[PDB]
């Protein structure tokens, strides 16, 4: 004899999709609104379990992308719209104490603004980077995003420093983390562990170099949905970090302008001191060692005796051609041609000249710009280049060389390097099984 028997609480899960809330231990990302995470995180190791993970078909990355976009929009909503700034500027070239690397990069633009009184004007000057002004045909210039989008001043109290956030699944759901240290990103994972929250992912915004990310453990990892495919970005995760030192040597002064009742526009006053180009430093020996390690783990998919070449970005906007990031409140676009200028066959610091943009078209959305307010003083930054976003050049000629060039732009690839090991599953605690019992 044998009959059904129902068990409640059995460890059975199915892959599913749900809303993952935030837990943390002002800011653009509402860290304060997040629930307080437990001081001692709980993680249960699972024995003799195999689950098929897929970093590229993951859904948590899409939710994180939507969440970051929503947080950006909700932080830029209650602050100053700069529509009066879209006016004909009369600009010259700044030449007082400028080096050879910044010849004409900054413009001294004088223009008329509305004052707090509606019927009175105001002739006020400011300093605009060459990338934020386009000529109209001293000369006449206008802000670059005045014929495509409306600018909203990044409102000076909010901070852009990425505070780590933990993505916690609701009750009735769990998150399987793939603890396998040789997990390439797509396939079965012998070592699965159940958790409730993620490991404090930093919403770092960068394009060519993954900054302040989570490192691998065993060796440098090469992840791609299809290495053979050339339309798929190759994520590279370093086992040891490469320190990058970022700096904006200019000593900027912020100047407040009354463009209306209560509304204030923060312009760049005269730079006190010497004007020097913003730049990045990366250890040459460390970078060469890391590139060699990457090539060593990159020849596996292409075989031995192949030539691995790193060249700079092949084209596109300033976001994809240059390593773009944000720190100290300022947005840097660094020409990483020195980094990827190498060929590999089977104390010195590389200096990357960076440019600064204030009219920021974040999240590649045409119709919503953002003016980053000037940051007082001199900005210095120290970051970890945790990973790379490479792209393989297509075609196949007689030569067997492969050229990998930095990519990016799509922040989904940036946030997929932190949610690769994580998967969200829905528990099914009801289960039927045979047993020899009956109700009396």
């Amino acid at each position, epitope marked *: 004899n044998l009959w059904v028997t129902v068990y409640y609480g059995v460890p059975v899960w199915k892959d599913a999709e749900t809303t993952l809330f935030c837990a943390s231990d002002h800011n653009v990302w509402a860290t304060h609104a997040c629930v307080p995470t437990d001081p001692n995180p709980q993680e249960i190791h699972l024995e003799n379990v195999t689950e098929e993970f897929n970093m590229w078909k993951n859904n948590m990355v899409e939710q994180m992308h939507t969440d970051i976009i929503s947080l950006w929009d909700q932080s830029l909503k209650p602050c100053v719209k700069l529509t009066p700034l879209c006016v004909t500027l009369q600009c010259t070239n700044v030449t007082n104490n400028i080096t050879d690397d910044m010849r004409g990069e900054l413009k001294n633009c004088s223009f008329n603004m509305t004052t707090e009184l509606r019927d009175k004007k105001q002739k006020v000057y400011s300093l605009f980077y060459r990338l934020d002004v386009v000529q109209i045909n001293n000369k006449e210039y206008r802000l670059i995003n005045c014929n*495509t989008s409306a600018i909203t001043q990044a409102c000076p109290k909010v901070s852009f420093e990425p505070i780590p956030i933990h993505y916690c699944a609701p009750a009735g759901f769990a998150i399987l983390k793939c603890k396998d240290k040789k997990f390439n990103g797509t396939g079965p994972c012998p070592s699965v562990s159940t958790v409730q929250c993620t490991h404090g992912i930093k919403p770092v915004v960068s394009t060519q170099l993954l900054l302040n990310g989570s490192l691998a453990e065993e060796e440098v990892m090469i992840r791609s*949905e*299809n290495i*053979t*495919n*050339n*339309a*798929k970005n190759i994520l590279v995760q370093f086992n040891t970090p490469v320190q990058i030192n970022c700096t904006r040597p200019n000593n900027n002064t912020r100047k407040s302008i009354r463009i209306g009742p209560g509304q204030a526009f923060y312009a760049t006053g005269d730079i006190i001191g010497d004007i020097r180009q913003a730049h990045c430093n990366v250890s040459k020996a460390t970078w060469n060692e890391t590139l060699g390690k990457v090539v060593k783990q990159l020849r596996k998919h292409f075989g031995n005796n192949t030539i691995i070449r790193f060249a700079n970005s*092949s*084209g*596109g*906007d300033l*976001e*994809v051609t240059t390593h773009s990031f944000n720190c100290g409140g300022e947005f840097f676009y660094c020409n990483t041609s020195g980094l990827f200028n190498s060929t590999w066959i089977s104390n010195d610091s590389i200096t990357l000249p960076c440019r600064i943009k204030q009219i920021i078209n974040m999240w*590649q959305r*045409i119709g919503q710009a953002m003016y980053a307010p000037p940051i007082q003083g001199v900005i210095r930054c120290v970051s970890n280049i945790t990973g790379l976003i490479l*792209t393989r*050049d*297509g*075609g*196949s*000629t007689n*030569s067997t*060389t492969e*050229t990998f060039r930095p*990519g990016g*732009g*799509d922040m989904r690839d940036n946030w997929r390097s932190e949610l690769y090991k994580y998967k969200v599953v829905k528990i099914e605690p009801l289960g039927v099984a045979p047993t020899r019992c009956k109700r009396r």
Partner: antibody
Amino acid sequence: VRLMQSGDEVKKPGASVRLSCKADGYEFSDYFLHWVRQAPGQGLEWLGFIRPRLGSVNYSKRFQGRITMTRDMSINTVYMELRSLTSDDTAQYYCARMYDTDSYKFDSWGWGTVVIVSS
Amino acid sequence: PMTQSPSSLSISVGDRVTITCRSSQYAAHNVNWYQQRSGKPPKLLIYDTSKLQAGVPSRFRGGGFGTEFTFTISSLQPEDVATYYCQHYEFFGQGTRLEIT
């Protein structure tokens, strides 16, 4: 989904030809655009692709350096410029739209633009 | 790269045809077949070697998973005279020309 190309062109050797490709009927941000050239009486050959979203490009190793692809979202066009033209570049150039990044799926093709390079 | 064979073949109307697509690298199922009519731009028929693009009649079918792929059209028709192209990612293949006997 319609991809209208540009007009048949004749260039002298050593000059640069800029073809265009206007795309309409679909959101010009989600689908990558490839340029596939075909010599007379020869098989299809891939030149390179461009992502209209941010202008990211990827050129074939055979045409690298001689080719440059740009996009213009306002007029909704993708342009491809070929430099240092030589005799064997006489071909018909098509602009295809890839549906999914995996399983390259050139759904819609342009009418084609024959570039004739001759003296 | 592809090694699509044969270069051409003469086939009577209604006869079954086969087009081998012997590849040189692991292509899995990401191989598509294009039909280019004489002069007209190429048109896609089969993607992923099994699925059929909408608007294509069901006589076309594909097969293969490894380095070998097959393309069949079952009942040939007068409007099926064209060139047929393999396509794995970037690389296309040498075309197969159909000629009515």
